[PDB]
Structures are given as C-alpha cells and as structure tokens.
Subunit: 348 residues, 2 copies
Amino acid sequence: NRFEASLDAQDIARISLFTLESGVILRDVPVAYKSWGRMNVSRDNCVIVCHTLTSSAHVTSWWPTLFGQGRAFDTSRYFIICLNYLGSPFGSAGPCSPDPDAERPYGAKFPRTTIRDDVRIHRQVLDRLGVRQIAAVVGASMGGMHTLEWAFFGPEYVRKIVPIATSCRQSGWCAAWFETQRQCIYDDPKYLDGEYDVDDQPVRGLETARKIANLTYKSKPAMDERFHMAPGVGQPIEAVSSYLRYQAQKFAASFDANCYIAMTLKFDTHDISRGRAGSIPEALAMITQPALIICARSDGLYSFDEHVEMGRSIPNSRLCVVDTNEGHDFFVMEADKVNDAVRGFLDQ
Amino acid sequence: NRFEASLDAQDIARISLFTLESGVILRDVPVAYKSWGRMNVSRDNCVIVCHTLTSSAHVTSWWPTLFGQGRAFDTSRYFIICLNYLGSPFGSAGPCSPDPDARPYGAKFPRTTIRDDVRIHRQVLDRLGVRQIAAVVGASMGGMHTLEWAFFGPEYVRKIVPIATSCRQSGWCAAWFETQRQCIYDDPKYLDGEYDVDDQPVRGLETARKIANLTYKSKPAMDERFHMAPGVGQPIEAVSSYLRYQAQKFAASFDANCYIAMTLKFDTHDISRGRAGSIPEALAMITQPALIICARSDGLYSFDEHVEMGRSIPNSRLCVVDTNEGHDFFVMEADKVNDAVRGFLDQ
C-alpha cells in the first residue's frame, strides 16, 4: 500500500471481528491511528480529533498550529488521538488493505461503511487503549459528522463536542456535488469498474473530481482576491488554468480512486436521527454535552443556517462564527482562530 | 451545421468584412437573429434581448412566458429582437460556420469578445433601420452584453435591464468555466479541436455541463429536490440520474469548440477596460435608467456585486427576486422576472 507507506510512523490496532451495521462482518481489521501526549492516571484526558475526507490520521500536517503547549491540542494536558476512517487509503481497513478472504487488497469490493461504523470501531480501539472518559471530540467537515455521532455515547463518556463546518444529515446539495465528483471517476476509461491496477489509476477522473471539490471548498470572495483582471485603464486571470491543474494533479498522484468513492459514499449515510428520533431537531436535543459549533457565513457546502439549527436544538450549545471570507476551507485557512475558539472552550 | 439546422426559421445578416477588436478580420460573416413584432414608423420601439451561453436566438424557447400581449416582450408594442453571438453553434459566425479561407472554422475560430458581439449586432440593427432602442434586456452572459450596449449612450439605448450578471470577469467564474473547459481538453475524443463533428468529445461536454448545471443551482433548491426519508425524484438515490439526464441531452446537441469559444468570451468581459480606472467609475458612465435583477442565492454572480451596480449606476433600481433558486432563477421564476421587466418598461 503506497499511500499508507508515504506516511510518518503510526500505530495499527487489529480488530479480529467487526460487524458493520449493514450486517457485513469484517475480519482481522486494521485501524490506524496517531496519538500525541499521555493519558493521565484517571485515563480521562483524551481528546479525539476526527479527520477530513482525504486526510490521514496525522492531523499535525494540516492543523499543525493547533498543537503544542498553550494551544488547543495541548500535549501537556491531553492525550490527543486521531483514528483513520474505514475506507481510507491511510492504514485502516479500506480498498487498499489486504482482503483476508483472498490472502490481494479488497479493491472495488470493500463493503459500505457508515459514519456510525467508524465511530463504533474507533471506540473499540479506545477501549483497548484503556480510555475511560473523553474530554472532547473535535472535528471539521466530514469529521464534524463523526463528532456529532460520538456525542450520542452520552455526557458520561463524551464530555464535550466541537463540531466544525458540518451537517446533521446528508443534503441534496452535497449529495449532488459528491456524486458529480464520483461520476468523473466512473467515466474515466481507466477505472475499469474499480478493477484498475493500483499504479495505473483513473488519474483524469480523480483530478477532475478534485478540482470540483477544491472549488466547492472555496468562496467567491476568496477566489476573487486570488485571481483578478488588471485595472481598467498567480494573480492574473490567465493563471487560473494552472492553479487548477497543479493541486489536482498532486492529489490524483497520491490518492486512490476506490477509496475516494468509498469515502464520499459515507456522506450519503449520514443522519444523526435515523433509528433514534423522528426529526433532526429531536435528535439534536438528545445531545446533552456542552457543544461548540464553529462555522463561517460563506461555507458553500455546509450552510450557516444549518449550523444555527444545530445551536437552536442542542440544549447546551454555543455558536462560534469565524470572522472570515474563506469558504468551507476556513477551518484550515483560519487555523489560529479555530485554535483560540477550541482552546477557550476546552478551558471552561 | 446540424445545430443551426435543428432550429425554427430565422434570419441571417451577412457582414462582408468585420474587424474584431483583436484586429483579426472576419470575412463574409453571418449574423443570425430572430425578431418578433413590428417596428413603428419612427423605428424606436426596438427591445433587444441578449441570450445565454448555450442558447440560440430563439428566446421563446426558454423564456416563453415573457412574450405576448400584456407581457414584458409585448409584440403589440415592440419590435423584439435577439441576435446570436459570435462563437455560437446556432447561426452566427463560429466554429461551426464555413471558413471563407478554406470546411468550417473548427478550432481556428478567432477569439471574440462581448464588445465584438455588441458591435456587429449594432451593425445589423443599423441595417434593419433601428433609430432607437427602447430597452436592452439580458441575463447571465446576456447581462454582460446588456451592460455593454449601455455605453452607446442614452440617446441610442434608452434603458437597460441587466439580470444575474457581472461588470467584469471574476476569479470565481473563471475557475468554474476553466474547470469545465478542461473536461473537454482532456477528453481523448477532442483531438485539439480537430474532432469530426459527429464524433464529439461527448464525455467532456457532459461533465462540463453537469458542473455548470449545479453552479446554476442553490443549496436550498437542491435540498428541496432531493432529501433523505424522515428519521424513524425525491430520494438521494435519484441524484445520480438527474445529473446524467440533462447533461447527456446537452452533449448530444451542442458543439465542444463552441463551448470553448463561448466561455472564453467571459474572460474578456470588463466594462471598464479602455474607458475608466475602476468598475465603479465605468458604471457611473451609464446614464440610462437601469433595472438590475438578481437573487440572493445566485452562486455565480453575487448579491453584493449587483448591489455595487445599483450603487454606482446613477439612475438604477435594484430588484431582488423573492426566491430560493440559484443562478437558474431567471428561468425558474420567469413570471416574476416578467413582471419586473414589464413594470420597468412601462415607466
């Protein structure tokens, strides 16, 4: 697995049998994770960070300024842990990991997993590490979906949550965007129904998917600052072409197509209320922990309004609106502001 | 030209020589157009409608309810005319039309700008004997031409209705349209624009159009159309084929090289270049009454930029359509746009 191989050192837990909520049984299941800091004697200073769609468990690589003495993820006070999602190419069971029923990797036959499946298996790993209580879950985008799900363990196990730039349930809007992206991959003749060779990926599908995704993560103001026309009578508009190509090419060179499909399909299963309550507001009201909901007005995927709805129905919640024009991106572009918010909340 | 061939009847004007603002000279240039109604004796009841990126001059086919007695484009009062842009597959000079130096222009059709279209169109209007224009009305790309028509001055162009549009190309829109063109550039069937006309880069074109179509939507509109069953088409399952369906139809009935040519036009747009030092200063040179129509959740052309138009155009009124639709709105909410345009044309 070349994708996992490119990472810094990390731990693997192996779960010998795991029942997906579909009823499919996974065997000999690796769950990759990375932790920083030390558990206290009481084993109750654990902070779980939930990562983003295409990231690895190594949160330090895109959230580096959230880490360290006095920062949000204060390695002097907390045991910070991030566990890799099923479906990912970075160590946990997914299309890229060995299939024990044919050993060859799962490839295109890796079962469907849900947000709730990840939360369940990740908590099994924590039980093994001996974690007795969780000081906080913090996660953005896809990770704020897991964060909301962790909360349902109750306030005795999960003390606080910080869902960032996220939703309670899949929306038509995002479903359409991610389906569009998946279709770019399905239509690449190199895809071969997911049977492609690992070093002959559907590169053009993946790029195109990534370009789309990357723009949905931006805002109009942000792209307008970055590229504009000369006054009347890179930065110029000419430079857009290669901006788009550059980072999309890098991603396609270093991510797996089948994992992109598997991970995004996870989004479609998300609903904090299914099986639990008759509506989203009623499910939100079952979240009893203090919550800090962090959002930006010009996130184009996860709306301001839906974050306001979270804050309205979660009984002990505070809404934090980041002062920015950056779009869904903001939680990375404005890392210092997110850090201050998270740290202030963790100190109460 | 199979694209032009699928249309209802229309007129063609032939301009024997036309100098593009690049300096490239086009020769024996067809300009296709379609009109409704009759000019009055004075020849001053002309309403120009500016069409959208992928549309023909046949505005009735996507704006049918704007036409008719008592409606905005009232064929009892006005001579309504829409001329086809250069670069389009539907009749005006473009990749699909005969090259006078050869066979169609194909991939070798010159860059044209918004200003080129306005100039050759106005030459056509001069031939038709139009002495004054009662109003120019247009949305998305058409709003760009609309703003450009205004620069002829209030003696020739009496009023403008720019709808869902911008004063200048933005990084945001350039990124979206360049992404779309890159879908076409990467389709192995594109062949640097040298493809055979009946073996189009269909997959590039579809993909470019799916992306485009979603950028025309809003979150609330997509959320109403597709959602999840309550806790414990309409379903999310149905998104897949919604995306394929209309995109497939488009790719079957539009030309790749034209898509490229047309979208590249967007990059040249700037009402201020050569005229003024900023956008606000150019907008202040617009002396006609203007009705600026927009929606709050247009994701391509922002509420704020229409507010800026209204702020700098001295005799302007901003009309914010009550809708949750996105860029689409001017079509989804045709009746509201009709009422606004008509009320303005009645002043």
